[model samples]
Target: PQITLWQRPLVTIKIGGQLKEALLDTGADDTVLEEMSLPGRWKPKMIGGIGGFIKVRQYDQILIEICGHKAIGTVLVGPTPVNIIGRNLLTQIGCTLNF
Candidate 1:
């Protein structure tokens, strides 16, 4: 299966037993999520985005399903304007640019 990048390559994914829509941002290095309460400990880190930078909680070894593709990786929870599915998990699902 392939995804067409019209404006923003958005996709449906399941995280923490909750289904949510996220943008497939190939330019991003790490996956970012809107603020959510997650269990376990996380490392405090700063991530750079289009606007600027913001502090985030880096949660490691989290399981997620992307369009039915299962993967376990790091997820950053913070003050993101939207949910971003970055290269960290995108590669697992074999996402690529058509052009």
Candidate 2:
């Protein structure tokens, strides 16, 4: 599926049996989502974004269903403006980026 430059590339992902929305904005190395509650334990960590660095809760090995593809990776929960899928999960699914 080809997309244009002006598109933000938003996609739906399923986590913990709940469907959520996010944009594959191709920004930082790690994906950052809006502040929310997650299962299991998470470490309080800091991550940088287009604006500035923020404190986030890092939950490792979380199961996420992208479209119909199921994958396990890390998720960062913080006070982000929007849910962004970055390099980490993007590469895991082999969503090669091209211009």
Say which candidate scores most in TM-score.
Answer: 1
Q: Write the per-residue lDDT of candidate 2 for residues 1-99, one digit (tens) a residue.
A: 555668678889988778889887766688888877788798999976667889999988998887777878899998999888888888777787786
RMSD of each: 1.2, 1.4
List, residue by residue over 1-96, the lDDT tens digit for candidate 1: 766655776788999888899998878899999987777689999987778989999999999998889998999999988999989988888877
lDDT of 1: 0.88
lDDT of 1 at 14: 90
Report the error of model 2 at residue 79, Å: 0.4
Give the range where candidate 2 is weakest over 10 consecutive residues by summed lDDT: 1-10
lDDT, model 2? 0.82
> How do all models score by TM-score?
0.91, 0.89
Off by over 4 Å in 2: none
State, as a TM-score between 0 and 1, how close model 1 is to the true structure. 0.91
